[PDB]
Amino acid sequence: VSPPPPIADEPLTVNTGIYLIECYSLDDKAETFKVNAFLSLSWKDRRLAFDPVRSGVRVKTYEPEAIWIPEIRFVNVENARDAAVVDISVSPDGTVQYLERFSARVLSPLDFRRYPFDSQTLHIYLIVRSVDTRNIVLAVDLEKVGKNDDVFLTGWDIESFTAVVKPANFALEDRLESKLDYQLRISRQYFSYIPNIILPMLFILFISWTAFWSTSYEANVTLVVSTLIAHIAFNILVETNLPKTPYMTYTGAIIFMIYLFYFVAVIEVTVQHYLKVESQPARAASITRASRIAFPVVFLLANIILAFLFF
Amino acid sequence: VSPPPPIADEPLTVNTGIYLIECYSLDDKAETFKVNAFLSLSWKDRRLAFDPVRSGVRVKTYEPEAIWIPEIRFVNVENARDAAVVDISVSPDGTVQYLERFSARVLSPLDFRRYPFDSQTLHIYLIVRSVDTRNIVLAVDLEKVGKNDDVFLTGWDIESFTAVVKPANFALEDRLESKLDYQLRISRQYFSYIPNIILPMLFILFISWTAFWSTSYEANVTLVVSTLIAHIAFNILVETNLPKTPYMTYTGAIIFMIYLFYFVAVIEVTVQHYLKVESQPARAASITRASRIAFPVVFLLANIILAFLFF
Amino acid sequence: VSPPPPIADEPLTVNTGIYLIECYSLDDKAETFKVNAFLSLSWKDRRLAFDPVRSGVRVKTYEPEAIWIPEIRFVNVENARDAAVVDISVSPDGTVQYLERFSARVLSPLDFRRYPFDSQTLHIYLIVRSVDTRNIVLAVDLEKVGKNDDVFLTGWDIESFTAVVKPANFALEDRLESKLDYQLRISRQYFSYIPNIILPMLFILFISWTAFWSTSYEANVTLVVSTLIAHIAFNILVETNLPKTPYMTYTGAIIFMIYLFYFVAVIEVTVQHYLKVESQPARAASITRASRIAFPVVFLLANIILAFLFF
Amino acid sequence: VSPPPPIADEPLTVNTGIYLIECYSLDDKAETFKVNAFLSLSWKDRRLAFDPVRSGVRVKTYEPEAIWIPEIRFVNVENARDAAVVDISVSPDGTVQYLERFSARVLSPLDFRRYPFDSQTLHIYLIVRSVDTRNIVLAVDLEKVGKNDDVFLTGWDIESFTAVVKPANFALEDRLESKLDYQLRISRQYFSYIPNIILPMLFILFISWTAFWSTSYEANVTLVVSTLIAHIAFNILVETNLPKTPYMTYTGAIIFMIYLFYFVAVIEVTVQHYLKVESQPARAASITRASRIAFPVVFLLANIILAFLFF
Amino acid sequence: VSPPPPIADEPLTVNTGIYLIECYSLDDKAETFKVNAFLSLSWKDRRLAFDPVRSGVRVKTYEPEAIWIPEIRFVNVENARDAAVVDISVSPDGTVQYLERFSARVLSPLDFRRYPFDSQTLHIYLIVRSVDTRNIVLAVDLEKVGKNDDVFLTGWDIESFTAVVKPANFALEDRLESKLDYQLRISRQYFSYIPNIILPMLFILFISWTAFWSTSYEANVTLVVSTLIAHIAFNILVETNLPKTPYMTYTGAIIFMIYLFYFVAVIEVTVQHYLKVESQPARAASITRASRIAFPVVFLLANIILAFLFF
Ligand SMILES: [Cl-]
Ligand SMILES: [Cl-]
Ligand SMILES: [Cl-]
Ligand SMILES: [Cl-]
Ligand SMILES: [Cl-]
Ligand SMILES: [Cl-]
Ligand SMILES: [Cl-]
Ligand code: NA
Ligand code: NA
Ligand code: NA
Ligand code: NA
Ligand code: NA
Ligand code: NA
């Protein structure tokens, strides 16, 4: 079979629409998500036109094999989509209405800069390669773009599912390609991070600061070193749920900065002891008394500065 | 092939039934479960009717290819079900009795609020898209809905497998869809959580409270900090077996609250020492003596309050 | 094609046999094992009978397509078995000898009560659904049931592979089903558990008891708390290799009971110190001296009681 | 199609050859390896003989469907090999030259006794089931058995890839089976184990022995217990990269034996303290002085004994 | 179908080109990467030639089935590539222009010597087996070799994608093979390693050196042993993200060398204490004072030496 013939030198417009049924498995490390949706296609093939009076029927159904169907592919998919044709319906003028149900693992990159308070725009790119007979251009039928109300992406809030109506028409391997951008706007459910990582991490830091109300070096060493190890465990736990980024993430910055607070606490604890031993407990007392105010104040201000730079 | 013709303008009723053979792999993190069941379908096709006297036979068997079979799909499945036809049997009036054995990874969400003392309702949604010739409506043949006695879901108790008999009939992409709800009610086997997480976690907390019967700061610091680290390990272990929820789980709340008890224990231990050093061991004694009663009482009451809010 | 016709009202006997080639991947957490075997089937179809004198040949080979083959399925498989037909041979009387090689992930539950000193009976259930023409019953041809000598299940000892010769005939969805039970009896290779978990766990416990020969509270606190943390690591390591059971496992019981020994050691260590501080080291000496005998004796007796209840 | 007819009562010889292209994913825990190779087959079928003068073509190419091809299977594979036919070439005498490229997950057991200084012989077993017309026997065409120079198995050194030329001809389910043994000899690259496990493990042990030059019980308890915990982590890390063996591995033995050294160090540390407290520091000094020589000497000799028993 | 006939004794040149659409999942442990690209093939088949005047058309489109297409395979792929034909276009002279879109898991080895400051050359090898009619040779059409601008390999910087234009022509199993080398040059994004592993690891080492400003043996033992355990955790974390190499990696060397610094710190701490006890605190003071300069200086120089050897 060959593509539909042009009335004049116009390109063939394939109207598209994606309707999400099930949306799942957003892997932060892999920057992938799995989708299960309907793909609807519509184009006019005058060769398929019929008189409803003579034929009796108002619409004609065809098997994919019987007629010409545009070779529509997804750009950013991992492997070729699993698709199964639901329906092909031809109206008297020759307007074909294709429907298929597909599933694919979509590869759309993520911006972890504000993690876990981040919002993402997932992309689904539809593309079509022009044949030698005629150029094929994609379009968006907005009435056939949507999502089910039940659509839930675990740990995420689905904001919108829309399409950039004007396609990106460009040359590739000496033939015209028409690309369409379907955007799924989502925002992370940060709630769990607060009682599981953020607050536990702050509690262990504040416990390290009880060393500023203790003259026992052996006890201080235990307090600051033990809590530093729990902070290492939280750093490791966090960096497992995330990929290696060439930039600093919000949680990454806080986690990093907290190491400096542990390092300065070890210095203060060491200075206090050296001075006590050197028979200068008065000077050690001044440093310890100052640290009690300095550490919380510098921690609070540094955090205001970070939140400001990141948001 | 085309769908059966209507006697009048009535829709075609496809009677359904699911009989679970094997139920397995409930992934809490993924909110998925795997099923292996029989799917039975029954509808009347007058075109297939025959006289049992003239034909000799009481029922006629057909291969799927020979006759019209309704396109039945699952809504909340991950990928398309794996199915294999067991039997197709036609009675003299034209009543078709289809049977297939399928397997699918079903995506039904879970409510972890009362974890690990939670009960779930897993869903299996059957759907059918109406064709242009006539509208197709689903029904439940209750005699063909059930589960095998051997059906075991590891770590769960299977309560019931029933179907909501009235289908959800709605419009989707300008065609009628008939959805059916099969509900598998299950309840978690919480027993293992008690000797593996709950009791070990309480033992480490009570060990931290032996610091209220000790005047040794060095020893107390070790007791409260070491046990706090073991509590961090239990928090991490628990949050690995669960997905990130936008709400507080029962175990999540207890685990979180226990951090506050560790934090206040560090404060008491610090106060006692500061006072002892400041040559006020009498005042430190009063605080330590009070803490011995305060800590268990506040822990017990806070737990009554939590159990009340959650159950 | 239709099933063989009955001489009288007797059911059709399909003689079966499974010969294991490769047996592997026993997942304790999932309660599954993978199998790679031969499935042999034999039934008489008089329609296929021939005279060896007239036909020249002693046996006739047929392709699955050509003749009627009973639809045999596995009950407890995860997905439908992967099978490939090796041979179909018809003798002059019409006796068909079918052979196929298959692989399947079999789902047979396990009893972890005596873990890691447990023995299991893995099951492979063959089933057949009766057609309307005639009822089909399964049988065991014992000469065609066996296993290869090389068959090795990693970490397990294969005791026997036998079949329960009388099938379980029952009604299901108003049709006779003939189920057969193939039993693979295996016993765990517990050897590795001894130097990797059991002996390391006992060594850390005995190290905690060196606190009964020490008056140093700071040192005792370190001894009992540090070793308690290593016991937590062993509890976590063990519960990862096992699923969540609604009953107590042997290792689970020992692991749990050992927590009580750590808890009582913390109490003794605390009592000794309180008494020493209260200027009563004589009374603290009596308690410490008693604990040196009490702890090993109670540990040894409690273990005799547990081994008795479990074996 | 039927198998080639015999000139006399001779069996049909299928000449085989495996040429490894890619060798990868050797899973120690699963005792599996993945292979990507060429499988070449050659047999004479006089029915395919042709005159090159009359036919125009020296050799004729056929699609697998067109002619009889022996059903060659792998014994020790997990699932059926993924294969794709490269070429089928028939010479005028009827000699068929089959070529296919396949990939399979081969299940060949491993001997971890000398781990990580072990050498393995991986096996690939080719088999063929005799048909009723005539018996089929396998052979090795040594010119068509080899491996690519680029063939690299991560963490292993590939020594040789050869075939045991004489097949194992045996009876199975009353039919002759011809098995062939392809052996891939490999040896582990132990180098990484030295700076990652062996040397770190020895360093922590030697650190524990600095307790023989210390009279501080509190410090010794910390030294021996802390380093014992690091040894537990190395034991856990090692047993994760390995399956549960019914025998003692070399690393397993060293790791186990080192626990006894930690246990005896705890005893010495306890004895020294008891004696110091009992006002017998002279006797405690003798024991501590002896331990300084005893511990390294017994460790060195025990290791000579182990290396001797294992190598 | 047979291959195109030669004008003379020349081989058939198949011009190739790979254009990367999506590049993803570079597994350091497995030494694999997943690719999703276009594969373009072009060769002359005079049998397909046509007069554009007589035929009307300028180019003729064919289905893969209709004409002869060279069997092109990838050498270093794991399983056979998943491919789907985009287009086949024949020009009047008989020049075929084939295009397919494929996905494959490519197995190309990596050099971890300079990890995480390493650069790699990933390879994609195209190959073709000569038929008996005529020899097939590969070529590079440079205009049809490229990559998409969006192509992102997580944690890596894509430098270039080029092809070694001269094929490797060699004999294999008595037939000519034409291999082509496509090279993807990438360099690791080391940035994340700095705040997550390198700086945390240096902070814990510097904390261990605060023992040179402390006379408290109990505190020093805690400082050096606790920080040594955190270094063990970083060693374990690092060796999990990497495969077992028969050579020393850059991070591996630094990590190893840091163990020696911990070992010597334990010796100094032990010597200081022995001397203090032996009533020689003056000599212990000299050693401690020297260590304060020696440790940072030797650490800094040893690192200069390592960076020099590795870069
Ligand atoms: Cl696609
Ligand atoms: Cl489905
Ligand atoms: Cl099955
Ligand atoms: Cl019954
Ligand atoms: Cl019946
Ligand atoms: Cl195979
Ligand atoms: Cl390929
Ligand atoms: Na078509
Ligand atoms: Na049908
Ligand atoms: Na059949
Ligand atoms: Na064949
Ligand atoms: Na072709
Ligand atoms: Na300590």
Residue numbers in the entry:
A (entry chain D), B (entry chain E), C (entry chain A), D (entry chain B), E (entry chain C): 5 to 315
Question: What did the study's authors say about this model?
Answer:
At present, the best structurally characterized pLGIC is the G. violaceus ligand-gated ion channel (GLIC), of prokaryotic origin. Each subunit consists of an extracellular domain (ECD), predominantly in a β-sandwich fold, and a transmembrane domain (TMD) composed of four helices, labeled M1–M4. However, the GLIC is a pH-gated channel, activated by lowering the pH, with a maximal activation at pH 4 and a pH50 around 5. We instead found that proton activation is a complex multiple loci mechanism, with the key contribution stemming from the coupling interface between the extracellular and transmembrane domain, with E35 acting as a key proton-sensing residue.
